[PDB]
Amino acid sequence: KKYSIGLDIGTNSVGWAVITDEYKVPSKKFKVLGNTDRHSIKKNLIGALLFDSGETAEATRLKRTARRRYTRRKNRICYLQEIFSNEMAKDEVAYHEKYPTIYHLRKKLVDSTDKADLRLIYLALAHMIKFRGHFLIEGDLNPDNSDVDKLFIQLVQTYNQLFEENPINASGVDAKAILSARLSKSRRLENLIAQLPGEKKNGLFGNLIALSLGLTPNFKSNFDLAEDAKLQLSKDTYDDDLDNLLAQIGDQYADLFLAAKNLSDAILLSDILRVNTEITKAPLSASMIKRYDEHHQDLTLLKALVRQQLPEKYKEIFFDQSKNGYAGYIDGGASQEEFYKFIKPILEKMDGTEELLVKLNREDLLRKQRTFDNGSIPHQIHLGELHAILRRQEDFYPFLKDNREKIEKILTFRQGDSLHEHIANLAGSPAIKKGILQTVKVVDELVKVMGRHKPENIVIEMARENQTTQKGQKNSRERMKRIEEGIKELGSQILKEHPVENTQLQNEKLYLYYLQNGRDMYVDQELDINRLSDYDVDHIVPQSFLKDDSIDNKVLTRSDKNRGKSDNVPSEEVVKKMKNYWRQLLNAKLITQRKFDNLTKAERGGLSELDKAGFIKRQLVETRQITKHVAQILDSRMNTKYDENDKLIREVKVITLKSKLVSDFRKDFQFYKVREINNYHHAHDAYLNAVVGTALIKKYPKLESEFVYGDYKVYDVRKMIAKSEQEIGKATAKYFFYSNIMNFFKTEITLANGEIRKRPLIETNGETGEIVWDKGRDFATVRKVLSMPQVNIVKKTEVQTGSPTVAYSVLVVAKVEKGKSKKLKSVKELLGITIMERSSFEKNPIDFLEAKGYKEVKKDLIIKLPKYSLFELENGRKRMLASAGELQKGNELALPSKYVNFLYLASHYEKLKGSPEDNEQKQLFVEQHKHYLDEIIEQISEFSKRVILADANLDKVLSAYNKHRDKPIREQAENIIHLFTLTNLGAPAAFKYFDTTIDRKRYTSTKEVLDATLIHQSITGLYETRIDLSQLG
RNA sequence: GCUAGAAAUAGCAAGAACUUGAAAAAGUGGCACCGAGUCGGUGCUU
């Protein structure tokens, strides 16, 4: 019936789930192929695909290659020729002297009314089509997406959004006056750095601006990388270099560099448009002409000066060509930087060299027309020049009038290539590109499974990479530098009387204690250093208005009753008393401008419609561009119908969600996530994403434009927010007065005063009268879904493509010679095929095997076995094929939800980060159910006895658990979480218990696989083909 | 390209599995309900 798909895209896993209207996951019967007696299996429509990174055919197909680009461009030229064909069917010296560069021809064709030869017109059009420019800016050129100021603000906004801890606030800066000024790149960089006292040229932001100006910054110090990663936007090989860089540090910084590129284009766009002589001209071509003219002037001046003053070495400049001279610059293989390095001392020595040096320092002296800068030209400019030329030559050529929109669409449409090329064009690491391809294939298979019925909704989450612990110190270092700078600026030696290190500053209440100068925020009294348990953590902006649990919106105080009776920010009576202390904490860079604004928001009226809209946009809109591109790919592949007009019929809505929504949903209703148990949590996150997405699109359809990707009817702030909290409640079409979007999930709403508001048991849409949430059946359903033990975890088997390396193994049945008599004995062996041997084997397998020493091979039974091939043995125990002589664990430990929640609460004991009432009730819940620990150990034991089969390790960990049974529950739960690594899917890894270290238990024997059941799994695992290998022989 | 010279050589100018296919590529895996130890059972219907 009606359904929706939830997706959790990551770098090592892709979670997927299908939900119905009642938020249930269907369980269906699937056919089982092969030659066994099992012909049907019942499977739950929920799972997660796993795929380790590596060298694969698919991977190379998704990499950018010169050849694919080349054929693309060639195709475009072919189309252009096809457009000119039907009418075409019905000088060198002159050209070069009249137009010494193509930009002369272009500017003439845009600014000349005279009739031109059609061949030159074709040359111009082909040059504009072949190198059409980037598509990072969407739509027509306008100051909103073109001026340097707005894009610089957008860059620092993206920066602060990506970090928010120690962010940069830039309001006084005049980005236009600094970046657009006519000076050298390095001097512009230093001039911008001078306006930011907290950042330096070698910092991350400094390196980003340097990258945007056209320099070659080094990002090793910003990310501590082992290998040097240099980036230059103008260089043609920047994209794959960025893809390498992003692969090292993750794709979260991808959008950052994208904004940097945009800033570069903006600076260039202001640098090119500055020489705007006439309003109706062609700025790019005219500027290239001016560059040519300056080149010509400087050239003739150089020859004059050289001939008069320096007769010697003229041949070295214009005749030798072997040492990168001017003759080498024009006729030889000498780059612009080499020519500058060669001609710098000649200009330094000579007299009468004024004016040439100010151009030399600005890197605009004797420039060529084919240089590294043309990659930055947007396509809207070429579209403008094309429109101008078409308008000038409209009456002369009728087919330009007839095919104007055709040519324009060919240049602007993004022709339509393959899906592999669309994924290859993306800006990200090969991992997320692989994941995107896998996601598309997963969607295709899922809609195939549902009788070719497309879902109503496809909810997308970009799964976050949990902390790798190398970053667990970086955050502590940044907050530590903030504390040290604030203390040194103020002058209160709290660190002298109470020394602390960056390790202890991870605690929320201690970090807030040091952020607040060891003083109460609301009262003029010193805080007790060793009585923080009695102290409460208050939210500057209540949770009823906005879900912000960062340090930016948190304070530490002895009692949260001091904020007063209002549900808003703390009252003016406290602000008036503490304004001096808050202004000293403000000017000491202990807090940001926004935090001071929120603390002092009652002085400027209180919450406003603009503030609530800003909160909604902060919570509901996704800033990451990569997510929008994934949604674009899925939307284009899923939605392809139209109507009579040129309007796209959107049958499937692609909803984009933030991780904070699902995380807070788990934390608020105790649907806790523990990644260490098994790999099911990806699928579970996908399911909860589907639930949350469907709930938001059903409750607030008019807010689709905020999350759903597409071109929808725009909206404002008046129709959304009610005048009064209660006096307009349930009597207007306004959806919500409180700015937190996730309130409709809650049954009750606790405000900042303590009054507990009640909401109906059944949530329905106001306009259409459709039930959107049943607060009873749906929570029971969610818990039931999280309790299901059968979740489809599939490891993508891949042939390796790129101490020899085995591409894949093969199952061979034949006979061999044994003993002195050379008697033939039938054998079945696992042979490893090297990457080199793969071609020869696929060319002629039998001859290869006969050369290897096998006799009488059965060609039909030769079975290809890539890495991670799954085999099943007795009692459902499963093993994956790692190599020709080693196996990996193939089972997933399914743990009941009650034990998962108990384990989370035991581990998250000190870091609950919640209200005291529920925190104490959770503590009592953990303490009362200590027996659950023994129960959990029993679970792993039975599970281990069934599928792991490691008696020695099990005895060791059982004994080690028996020695430390009386230890506290927190550390005990942590050591059980560590102990779960023994049963984790994949390769055995060494893990640490309380004082024990359990070494890996390798599986060196491989003979049993030869008589097990090989299970060929589809990408989702719903479709299985099971081959009983014991029957082959 | 311009001037000389038998040349050589000199002066100048200027800008997963399976099926079909060679391949790209097309195809192959029923619907509800009660449960839930890696999925089981029942009804309908191929």
Residue numbers in the entry: 3 to 92, 124 to 447, 716 to 1103, 1136 to 1366
Task: Give verbatim lines from the article.
The basis for Cas9’s utility is its DNA recognition mechanism, which involves base-pairing of one DNA strand with 20 nucleotides of the guide RNA to form an R-loop. The guide RNA’s recognition sequence, or “spacer,” can be chosen to match a desired DNA target, enabling programmable site-specific DNA selection and cutting. The search process that Cas9 uses to comb through the genome and locate rare target sites requires local unwinding to expose DNA nucleotides for RNA hybridization, but it does not rely on an external energy source such as ATP hydrolysis. The described linear- and bent-DNA conformations present a new model for Cas9 function in which open-protein Cas9:sgRNA first associates with the PAM on linear DNA, then engages a switch to the closed-protein state to bend the DNA and expose its PAM-adjacent nucleobases for interrogation.
